[PDB]
């Protein structure tokens, strides 16, 4: 029910150890979202899925197929 963020004291938001994309920003890496029983949860935001590229001095990856993507700007 109470959570000291670096942005200030946050009250009524449930602190969570899991991490998600930033739904509502709060500051200093904290975000909050309404989730399931429902509550406003608050969490340290995820920056993206973590990945290790399969690098070595003699391995290459080459695309065997493609997709045409139409994107709107």
């Amino acid at each position: 029910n109470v959570f000291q963020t670096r942005a200030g004291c946050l009250i009524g938001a449930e602190h969570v150890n899991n991490s998600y994309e930033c739904d509502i920003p709060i500051g200093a890496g904290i975000c909050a979202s309404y989730q399931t029983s429902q509550s406003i949860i608050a969490y340290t935001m995820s920056l993206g899925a973590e990945n290790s590229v399969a690098y070595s001095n003699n391995s290459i990856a080459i695309p065997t197929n493609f997709t045409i993507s139409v994107t709107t700007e």
Binding site: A28, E50, N51, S52, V53, P63
Partner: protein
């Protein structure tokens, strides 16, 4: 070196203009929605500084991390990759950049949405993608490629035939390693290199210090201390004196918010440039003459700095 964001501010214009005086607050209501539109403008600036930062650093969809074995064909990225020795894993060069760059009146500073550690995880991801996969992580999935073969693609991209790399690879690696060494000497010795970021710190500090000092000004009232007017005078005359302080303090805020809106447009122009150098210099290989440093451009590495980004072109 490029500015990307500036210190986010929130100003309680009721506490700036009046502060605890309910007599002044009831006069300030007669000026209408000036106080909500000042807060709206500073909030638009403040939310934009998080967008400016997101547009520059969040160009990578997945947080790439480098392999445990650093078999990059003689190129030594250790000064620009994350340092495990540190509590927050900035690179060695990012720590040089973070060392070179250095109230009650309703004025406050809001924190950035991304911590300096999250900015460093993005420069780590951009750099680990760039080293392990060339431009490919910008176009789609990161495709591994050996770094000597990636640099042979970078050489073909400048019209130098790729055998000129493989037949000189130890020389090219030693020149790159030496050139990264000269960056550490430059950033250790010469603080004036970061002046473009330090000026963004100085301008925003000077603007708040000027906004504070303008509370001491009378604007033609009998005193600038609002409790002098309310202790010495009575409402039929005190309101005439307080309207001079309200008018001058409201004009002092409109001056600050106007120059912060103009300064935010200058920072956004720099953040859109830095986001374009991230896409074209880091995620690609720009043909654009002098866009990614003076010379035929091979590749660029992003490093974080306070309120900015630093490209090692």
């Amino acid at each position: 070196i490029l500015p990307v964001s500036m210190t986010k501010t929130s100003v309680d214009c009721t506490m700036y203009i009046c502060g605890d005086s309910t007599e002044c607050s009831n006069l300030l209501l007669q000026y209408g929605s000036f106080c909500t539109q000042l807060n709206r403008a500073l909030t638009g600036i403040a939310v934009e500084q998080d967008k400016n930062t997101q547009e520059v650093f969040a160009q990578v969809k997945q947080i790439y991390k480098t392999p445990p074995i650093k078999d990059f064909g003689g190129f030594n990225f250790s000064q620009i990759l994350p340092d495990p020795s540190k509590p927050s894993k900035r690179s060695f060069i990012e720590d040089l950049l973070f060392n070179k760059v250095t109230k009650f009146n309703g004025l406050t500073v809001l924190p950035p949405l991304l911590t300096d550690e999250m900015i460093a995880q993005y420069t780590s991801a951009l750099l680990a993608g760039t080293i392990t996969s060339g431009w490919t992580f910008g176009a789609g999935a990161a495709l591994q490629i050996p770094f000597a073969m990636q640099m042979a693609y970078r050489f073909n991209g400048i019209g130098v035939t790729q055998n000129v790399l493989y037949e000189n690879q130890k020389l090219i690696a030693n020149q790159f390693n030496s050139a990264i060494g000269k960056i550490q000497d430059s950033l250790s010795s010469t603080a004036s290199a970061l002046g473009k970021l330090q000026d963004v710190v100085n301008q925003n500090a000077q603007a708040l210090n000027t906004l504070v000092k303008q509370l001491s000004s009378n604007f033609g009232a009998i005193s600038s201390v609002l409790n002098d007017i309310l202790s010495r005078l009575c409402p039929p005359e005190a309101e005439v004196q307080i309207d001079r302080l309200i008018t001058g303090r409201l004009q002092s805020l409109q001056t600050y918010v106007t120059q912060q809106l103009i300064r935010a447009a200058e920072i956004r122009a720099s953040a859109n440039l830095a986001a374009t150098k991230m896409s074209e210099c880091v995620l690609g290989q720009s043909k654009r003459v002098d866009f990614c440093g003076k010379g035929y451009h091979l590749m660029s590495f992003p490093q974080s700095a306070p309120h900015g980004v630093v490209f090692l072109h």
